[PDB]
Design a protein around this ligand. Sequence first.
Ligand SMILES: Nc1ncnc2c1ncn2[C@@H]1O[C@H](COP(=O)(O)OP(=O)(O)O)[C@@H](O)[C@H]1O
Ligand SMILES: Nc1ncnc2c1ncn2[C@@H]1O[C@H](COP(=O)(O)OP(=O)(O)O)[C@@H](O)[C@H]1O
Lengths: 179, 297, 248, 99, 50, 50, 100
Amino acid sequence: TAQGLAWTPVGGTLLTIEVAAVPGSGKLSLTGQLGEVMKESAQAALTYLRAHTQDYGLPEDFYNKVDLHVHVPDGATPKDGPAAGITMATAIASALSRRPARMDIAMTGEVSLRGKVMPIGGVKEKLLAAHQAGIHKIVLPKDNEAQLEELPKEVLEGLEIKLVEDVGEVLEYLLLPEP
Amino acid sequence: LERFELDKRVAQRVKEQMDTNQREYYLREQMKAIQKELGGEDGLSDLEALRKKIEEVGMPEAVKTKALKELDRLERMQQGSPEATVARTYLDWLTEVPWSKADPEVLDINHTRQVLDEDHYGLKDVKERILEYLAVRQLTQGLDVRNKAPILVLVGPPGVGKTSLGRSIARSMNRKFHRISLGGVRDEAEIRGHRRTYIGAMPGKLIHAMKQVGVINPVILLDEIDKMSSDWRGDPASAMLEVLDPEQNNTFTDHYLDVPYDLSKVFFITTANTLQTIPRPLLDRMEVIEIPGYTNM
Amino acid sequence: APILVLVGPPGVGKTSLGRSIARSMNRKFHRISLGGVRDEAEIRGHRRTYIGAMPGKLIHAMKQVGVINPVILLDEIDKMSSDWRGDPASAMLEVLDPEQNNTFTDHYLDVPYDLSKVFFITTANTLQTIPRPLLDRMEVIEIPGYTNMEKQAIARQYLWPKQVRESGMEGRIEVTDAAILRVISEYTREAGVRGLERELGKIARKGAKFWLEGAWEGLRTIDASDIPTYLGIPRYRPDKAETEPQVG
Amino acid sequence: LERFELDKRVAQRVKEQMDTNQREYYLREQMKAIQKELGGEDGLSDLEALRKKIEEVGMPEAVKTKALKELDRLERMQQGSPEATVARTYLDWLTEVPW
Amino acid sequence: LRKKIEEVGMPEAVKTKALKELDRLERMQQGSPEATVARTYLDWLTEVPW
Amino acid sequence: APILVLVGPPGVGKTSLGRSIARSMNRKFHRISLGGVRDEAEIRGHRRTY
Amino acid sequence: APILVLVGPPGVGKTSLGRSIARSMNRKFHRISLGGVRDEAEIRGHRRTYIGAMPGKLIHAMKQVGVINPVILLDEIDKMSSDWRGDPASAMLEVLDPEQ
Ligand SMILES: Nc1ncnc2c1ncn2[C@@H]1O[C@H](COP(=O)(O)OP(=O)(O)O)[C@@H](O)[C@H]1O
Ligand SMILES: Nc1ncnc2c1ncn2[C@@H]1O[C@H](COP(=O)(O)OP(=O)(O)O)[C@@H](O)[C@H]1O
């Protein structure tokens, strides 16, 4: 389980599932009703099995060979951003890690091949979705340092912003044990 | 005999059904005998009282001539005559929109700053593009209150007290706030109406709120315009983009407005709260302000 | 005689080009977007049978202009579709070519209208989706985006004077080459000029807000320095010369 | 007593309502009665012309039988009825395709 | 509408078209789409350049 | 017996051959494209009832 | 306790005796070959990937019968291939055990 948060156009939610661990062959499949740009991003995510097998600490056999049973809660998954398809990759990255997530400690950002978190859009909307739910611990990319103060002074009074610089550093800010 | 008793059964069904229809018919005509109770008073207010209001309204000689023109034709036996309907339906907002009164224009954008500081706390994003809106609202292509431009439609969740928003800006602009029903209603009678040759065609709710005050420049909140659609095909696109164009709004006709109304100093606001349910020709004369909402605290 | 097609992304001045040509011809001008059309039921009329039965978009287009000889711009004939029964591609086929449309009629109408004299353009955006019998007898012209130099030329010479003239900023706000250099090379990244109008408007009406809170300077210079003051932050890099020299 | 008189004035008002309704409705059937005398008559000349076209176009007998039975369905209002304008289109399709 | 069609130059067949549909007016003016939609038709015909 | 199918490149003379035969046989040439058709109704006949 | 595997001569003896017992127990006999069945998406359901996701053939065996307790004969259990996601055998072991 990973807080692959994606802002819905209507309201605001914290996108996440409960995850199995049933590996074996590269066919994690979902009828997520995804968009066409998210369709081609998923077609990229096919070979991102060979890309995420090397960008993080994940083993080499991830190049082609992992299943699991994934059920994304919002069947109306298109939420006006590329925070739909990387969710399964992040969930498997936590799954092949085999160690769980951190209680009431979410994450967000944008993932890259080189291993850096690009700042996630809508810091106000992601922090409304984070706080209106009730989570008080926030993992934002480092370049949102200037966009933390661009928000009004009533959203972040119970919010702690644990700034992140790498996608590995997301893993320490999201994976339950210390590493 | 089974067929015969079936005949008796179906005869009972048809008798109860016709009794039901008759009873509903009597029920509606009571409503019409309970509503027509104040019909005479409407005619009285539509008579000498109407003329008095027209005098105080001081409608432009052209508009006054129109009112007098139809009114002189409507001059006759008030009873057993529809002259009262055409003497009120079209001359009620004409008698309720005096041109000797209007909302005080706040040319001071700084004043707006202060009054929007206490909407909730200023909101720091609403008031900035609102204040763009006012400083431009003074300073336009004609350096006056003419658009040729957007009036700044909202986009957001509906949860805020948007009524209080319209009131605090109608305070920061000394405007007479109104509300109508325009979004969610699916018939061109609250939005356009149709030409005054049938009822159900009606003054729009904009015309009704225009009747709600005497000031010639009220603020008619086009209520939840995001859910706008109408069962009457033949788009109000003509209506909405004709009223959004001041060159077409000083000449604002509709299906209902068979005379170009002098909607010239009239101010509107536009309100969207959903980003997909939009008929296309409102792509223009619209622009969006950030409106921050509320966290759980 | 083949009809012009002006394929290319939105916001590259396709319909304003038609405005120019109308000026050049001293006719009127009009557009009707066929983007998201899925039936013959609205291009030709719906057969008139109730309130809520409508003539065609060409009939409307004819109705707005008050001239029998305008220059119609059939915008977005590439987003023409048929996902439900009814293939109106042939309807536009009988519209375009000059001989057969001489007595054109919609299903709502019965009048054979004359359309041989009416000059046409026909805007699309990509011809790979036009029906192939449509694609015969036209001219395929891609219209590109514009270089950074060309885009600042659009702004400085043709757009930014419109931004300052809609919002009363005429002769009270000066905006430099450095500022609009920042506008394109630092802030705005898109095919057409479409969003440029919007963030430029943000700059513009913020500046009008600044001028009406006191005209201490009658000339308020918005250069590349105060660009983040009037608008928000630079959300993309100024130059692509500054990322990193990458390995592979 | 004032409730009594209010009910009486309501009774007179609904009496007037039903008087008005029967009068205006009687006008509705008078306009219909004066209408079908000529008002509906002139529109039938269209149907006569279309039928003459069907009769004059040489057709096989199955064609003509289907045409006449579809035509008898057309002997109704279509002008606000989308269920018989399709009949007019049908009969005009038949008479204007060669045989 | 008769005046407007009279002034807006019509083809004589289209002129008689409008006159016939005008006779489809003059019968009702209120309620069902019976001359109301016909009024929409006539308004469409009038306000097209000729 | 067969019905004379034509196959070949997109721009090569096909409809030219058709019109050539048509004039040759004193025939009215015509063309109906069938690109993208997937309904039987849109080319045979759609349900008449509505 | 066993469920009486039938092995020996191909096409000979096995189904005959099974139908004989189902006649004796008066349970609605059925018979399903699994030779071409080598995917667990055919044993249990197919994971939904398009329009036309489909159940296991064992439900389809239950679909051809109107009871939840007949005698059913399965066929070709002695081979196995992991040509798809996992094996079809594991889902069949799920079918065998009573709490599964
Ligand atoms: N070799 C040719 N001879 C005559 N006409 C040609 C030739 N090649 C192309 N054309 C022209 O190409 C047009 C397209 O029709 P045609 O070439 O017959 O089939 P297609 O539409 O498959 O290309 C015709 O109008 C014709 O005038
Ligand atoms: N002892 C027996 N008496 C009668 N028939 C037999 C006997 N043993 C085998 N058979 C025949 O063997 C066949 C059973 O084999 P079959 O149902 O074809 O496949 P499998 O044995 O692989 O299930 C029956 O058709 C039956 O006629």
